[PDB]
Scaffold this motif. Structure first.
Motif, PDB file in Angstrom:
ATOM      1  N   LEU A 105      -5.094  -5.631   7.196  1.00  0.00           N
ATOM      2  CA  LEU A 105      -5.473  -4.247   6.901  1.00  0.00           C
ATOM      3  C   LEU A 105      -6.676  -4.174   5.962  1.00  0.00           C
ATOM      4  O   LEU A 105      -7.573  -3.367   6.175  1.00  0.00           O
ATOM      5  CB  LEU A 105      -4.274  -3.516   6.282  1.00  0.00           C
ATOM      6  CG  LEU A 105      -3.100  -3.301   7.240  1.00  0.00           C
ATOM      7  CD1 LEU A 105      -1.901  -2.739   6.497  1.00  0.00           C
ATOM      8  CD2 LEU A 105      -3.474  -2.342   8.361  1.00  0.00           C
ATOM      9  N   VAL A 135       1.624   6.820  -6.957  1.00  0.00           N
ATOM     10  CA  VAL A 135       0.667   7.918  -7.190  1.00  0.00           C
ATOM     11  C   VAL A 135       1.327   9.276  -6.978  1.00  0.00           C
ATOM     12  O   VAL A 135       1.113  10.188  -7.771  1.00  0.00           O
ATOM     13  CB  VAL A 135      -0.575   7.789  -6.295  1.00  0.00           C
ATOM     14  CG1 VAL A 135      -1.479   9.025  -6.351  1.00  0.00           C
ATOM     15  CG2 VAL A 135      -1.428   6.595  -6.714  1.00  0.00           C
ATOM     16  N   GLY A 136       2.201   9.408  -5.981  1.00  0.00           N
ATOM     17  CA  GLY A 136       2.970  10.620  -5.757  1.00  0.00           C
ATOM     18  C   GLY A 136       3.777  11.055  -6.971  1.00  0.00           C
ATOM     19  O   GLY A 136       3.801  12.238  -7.290  1.00  0.00           O
ATOM     20  N   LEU A 164       1.227  12.493  -9.747  1.00  0.00           N
ATOM     21  CA  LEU A 164       0.741  13.806  -9.344  1.00  0.00           C
ATOM     22  C   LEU A 164       1.810  14.881  -9.456  1.00  0.00           C
ATOM     23  O   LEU A 164       1.488  16.000  -9.835  1.00  0.00           O
ATOM     24  CB  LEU A 164       0.221  13.745  -7.910  1.00  0.00           C
ATOM     25  CG  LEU A 164      -1.046  12.915  -7.754  1.00  0.00           C
ATOM     26  CD1 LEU A 164      -1.386  12.769  -6.288  1.00  0.00           C
ATOM     27  CD2 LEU A 164      -2.232  13.563  -8.443  1.00  0.00           C
ATOM     28  N   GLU A 201       0.887   4.029  -3.059  1.00  0.00           N
ATOM     29  CA  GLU A 201       0.874   5.436  -2.663  1.00  0.00           C
ATOM     30  C   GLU A 201       2.090   6.195  -3.211  1.00  0.00           C
ATOM     31  O   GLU A 201       1.929   7.230  -3.849  1.00  0.00           O
ATOM     32  CB  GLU A 201       0.836   5.470  -1.134  1.00  0.00           C
ATOM     33  CG  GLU A 201       0.927   6.854  -0.499  1.00  0.00           C
ATOM     34  CD  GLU A 201       1.343   6.701   0.963  1.00  0.00           C
ATOM     35  OE1 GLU A 201       0.493   6.283   1.776  1.00  0.00           O
ATOM     36  OE2 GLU A 201       2.521   6.962   1.277  1.00  0.00           O
ATOM     37  N   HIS A 243      -1.458  -5.425   9.831  1.00  0.00           N
ATOM     38  CA  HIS A 243      -1.302  -4.261  10.700  1.00  0.00           C
ATOM     39  C   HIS A 243      -0.089  -4.437  11.617  1.00  0.00           C
ATOM     40  O   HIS A 243       0.013  -5.473  12.263  1.00  0.00           O
ATOM     41  CB  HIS A 243      -2.585  -4.135  11.515  1.00  0.00           C
ATOM     42  CG  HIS A 243      -2.636  -2.918  12.385  1.00  0.00           C
ATOM     43  ND1 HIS A 243      -1.747  -2.607  13.414  1.00  0.00           N
ATOM     44  CD2 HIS A 243      -3.606  -1.970  12.325  1.00  0.00           C
ATOM     45  CE1 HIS A 243      -2.196  -1.456  13.925  1.00  0.00           C
ATOM     46  NE2 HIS A 243      -3.315  -1.062  13.306  1.00  0.00           N
ATOM     47  N   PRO A 244       0.861  -3.497  11.680  1.00  0.00           N
ATOM     48  CA  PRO A 244       2.188  -3.783  12.216  1.00  0.00           C
ATOM     49  C   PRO A 244       2.233  -4.009  13.730  1.00  0.00           C
ATOM     50  O   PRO A 244       3.173  -4.633  14.210  1.00  0.00           O
ATOM     51  CB  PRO A 244       3.064  -2.610  11.781  1.00  0.00           C
ATOM     52  CG  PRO A 244       2.071  -1.480  11.584  1.00  0.00           C
ATOM     53  CD  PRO A 244       0.837  -2.196  11.060  1.00  0.00           C
ATOM     54  N   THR A 245       1.239  -3.556  14.498  1.00  0.00           N
ATOM     55  CA  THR A 245       1.191  -3.800  15.948  1.00  0.00           C
ATOM     56  C   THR A 245       0.116  -4.800  16.343  1.00  0.00           C
ATOM     57  O   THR A 245       0.372  -5.635  17.203  1.00  0.00           O
ATOM     58  CB  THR A 245       1.038  -2.504  16.754  1.00  0.00           C
ATOM     59  OG1 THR A 245      -0.182  -1.868  16.491  1.00  0.00           O
ATOM     60  CG2 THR A 245       2.141  -1.504  16.471  1.00  0.00           C
ATOM     61  N   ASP A 259       0.802  -1.218   0.000  1.00  0.00           N
ATOM     62  CA  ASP A 259       0.000   0.000   0.000  1.00  0.00           C
ATOM     63  C   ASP A 259       0.845   1.282   0.000  1.00  0.00           C
ATOM     64  O   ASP A 259       0.513   2.240  -0.690  1.00  0.00           O
ATOM     65  CB  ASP A 259      -0.978  -0.019   1.180  1.00  0.00           C
ATOM     66  CG  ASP A 259      -0.361  -0.148   2.580  1.00  0.00           C
ATOM     67  OD1 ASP A 259       0.864  -0.359   2.718  1.00  0.00           O
ATOM     68  OD2 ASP A 259      -1.136  -0.001   3.548  1.00  0.00           O
ATOM     69  N   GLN A 260       1.965   1.308   0.713  1.00  0.00           N
ATOM     70  CA  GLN A 260       2.876   2.440   0.688  1.00  0.00           C
ATOM     71  C   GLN A 260       3.642   2.555  -0.625  1.00  0.00           C
ATOM     72  O   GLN A 260       4.022   3.656  -1.009  1.00  0.00           O
ATOM     73  CB  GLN A 260       3.859   2.349   1.852  1.00  0.00           C
ATOM     74  CG  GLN A 260       3.126   2.431   3.193  1.00  0.00           C
ATOM     75  CD  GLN A 260       4.055   2.609   4.374  1.00  0.00           C
ATOM     76  OE1 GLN A 260       5.216   2.968   4.259  1.00  0.00           O
ATOM     77  NE2 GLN A 260       3.570   2.362   5.566  1.00  0.00           N
ATOM     78  N   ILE A 288      -0.523  15.158 -13.588  1.00  0.00           N
ATOM     79  CA  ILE A 288      -1.579  14.304 -14.143  1.00  0.00           C
ATOM     80  C   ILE A 288      -2.279  13.609 -12.974  1.00  0.00           C
ATOM     81  O   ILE A 288      -1.615  13.165 -12.046  1.00  0.00           O
ATOM     82  CB  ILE A 288      -0.967  13.314 -15.158  1.00  0.00           C
ATOM     83  CG1 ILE A 288      -0.315  14.058 -16.339  1.00  0.00           C
ATOM     84  CG2 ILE A 288      -1.998  12.323 -15.688  1.00  0.00           C
ATOM     85  CD1 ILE A 288       0.918  13.389 -16.889  1.00  0.00           C
TER      86      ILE A 288
END
Lengths: 205, 51, 52, 52
Positions: free
Chosen positions: D44, D9-10, D13, D6, D37-39, D2-3, D17
Motif C-alpha cells: 500500500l 485520529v477519530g 477529533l 485513522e 493490499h488485501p486483493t 493504517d485503520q 482538537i
C-alpha cells in the motif's frame, strides 16, 4: 471572552433554524415554529445502512428530488463527516473519498456545496443535562440535505459588544452592589422556510 | 542541613495566551446567503398548484 | 451560549469558564567513568572511543 | 496499521482538537510500511521504505 461572544451569536442561527431550540437552556422554542427538521423527508439509518454515509446522503437527495425540488447544499455533523471521509471500499479496503482528509472542512461533496459543524447534531446545547430537548430521547441527526435557497434569513439589526456597569442585567444581583461588570452583544435574525419539502434529514432513532 | 529551593516556595511562571478547544461554526450562514431585511416579519409568495 | 428572547422577555447570563494547568521540571544527567590509561590509548592510537 | 492510526485520529477529533503529529514505534512503523493490499497483494505504502 469578547471573541467567544460573537461565535455564540453565530451558532444560534443553526440551533434556531435547524433544531428550533433556545441555545442556552437547549429546550425547544415555545411556539412550535417552522424548523428544517419538521420535514417528512427522513432517511433512517438501520444497523446495515450505518457505516455507509455516502449512501445515506444520496438517499436523502433522492427524497428532495422526488418532491420536485433540486438540492444545492449539504450540512454534516462533524462526527459523521469524519465517518464519511474515512469510508473504506468493502473489498479493497482503500479510502473511497481521499480528498475529504479527516472530514473537518468538507467544502463540497457529490455535486453539492457543503458545510460541517457539531451544530447539525444540536451541539452540546441540545443535550444539556437538566433541560436540553434531546437529553432523554435523541433524534440523532447525522446530516441535512436540501435546497438551502428555501431557507431565507438576514440580520435585521445588530447591537455590537458593549459593557454594562449598572442595575441587575441578568437577575443575579446589582452590578454596583456586587462590584461586578457584564459584557453583552445582541443580534436579531429574520428566519423563514418556504417549504419543508426542500429539505431531507439523515437520522438514527 | 543543605539549603534547597524547597525552602523558598517560589511562585510559578505565568505563560502568555489561552489554550482553547475550537467551536463548530454556523452551517446556515454558509449554505444560505443572507438577504438584506428591514426589521419585522417578512412575507413570501408561493405557487400552491399549477394550471 | 446565546439565548433567544421575546420583546420583553427577561435576558439571562452565560459566561466563559477557565482553569490553569501546570508544568513539572525534570533534571537528567549522564556520567561515564574511565581509567587514565584509556585516555592515553585513545589519543596515541587515534581510537575515537572518547569521541563516541 | 493504517485503520488503527485513522481510528485514533477519530478519537482526538471527537474531543474537538485537531491532531497535527504522529509518533510510531519502530516495529509498528515497519508493519505499516510493509502493509499489503488485501486483493492485489502489492504494498500500500511503498514510499515508506522499511518505515525507519
Amino acid at each position: 471572552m469578547a471573541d467567544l461572544s460573537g461565535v455564540a451569536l453565530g451558532r444560534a442561527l443553526d440551533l434556531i433554524g435547524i433544531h428550533g431550540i433556545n441555545p442556552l437552556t437547549g429546550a425547544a422554542l415555545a411556539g412550535t415554529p417552522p424548523k428544517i427538521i419538521d420535514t417528512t423527508n427522513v432517511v433512517e439509518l438501520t444497523t446495515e445502512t450505518l457505516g455507509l454515509p455516502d449512501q445515506a446522503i444520496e438517499a436523502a437527495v433522492g427524497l428532495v428530488l422526488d418532491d420536485s425540488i433540486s438540492p444545492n447544499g449539504l450540512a454534516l455533523d462533524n462526527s459523521f463527516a469524519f465517518k464519511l471521509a474515512t469510508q473504506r471500499h468493502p473489498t479493497t479496503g482503500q479510502k473511497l473519498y481521499p480528498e475529504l482528509g479527516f472530514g473537518t472542512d468538507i467544502s463540497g461533496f457529490m455535486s453539492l456545496g457543503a458545510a460541517v459543524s457539531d451544530t447539525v447534531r444540536g451541539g452540546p446545547e441540545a443535550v444539556t443535562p437538566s433541560t436540553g430537548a434531546y437529553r432523554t430521547t435523541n433524534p440523532n441527526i447525522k446530516a441535512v440535505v436540501g435546497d438551502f435557497s428555501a431557507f431565507r434569513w438576514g440580520v435585521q439589526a445588530n447591537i455590537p459588544l458593549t459593557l454594562i456597569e449598572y442595575g441587575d442585567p441578568d437577575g443575579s444581583g446589582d452590578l454596583q452592589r456586587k462590584n461586578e461588570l457584564a459584557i453583552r452583544a445582541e443580534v436579531v435574525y429574520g428566519v423563514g422556510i418556504l417549504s419543508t419539502d426542500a429539505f431531507a434529514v439523515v437520522r438514527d432513532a | 542541613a543543605v539549603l534547597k529551593t524547597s525552602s523558598f516556595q517560589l511562585p510559578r511562571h505565568l505563560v502568555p495566551g489561552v489554550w482553547q478547544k475550537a467551536q463548530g461554526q454556523s452551517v446556515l450562514a454558509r449554505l444560505s446567503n443572507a438577504e438584506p431585511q428591514e426589521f419585522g416579519e417578512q412575507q413570501y409568495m408561493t405557487l400552491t398548484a399549477p394550471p | 451560549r446565546g439565548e433567544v428572547v421575546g420583546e420583553s422577555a427577561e435576558k439571562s447570563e452565560s459566561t466563559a469558564t477557565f482553569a490553569p494547568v501546570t508544568s513539572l521540571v525534570r533534571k537528567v544527567q549522564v556520567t561515564q567513568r574511565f581509567s587514565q590509561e584509556v585516555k592515553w590509548a585513545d589519543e596515541s592510537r587515534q581510537l575515537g572511543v572518547l569521541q563516541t
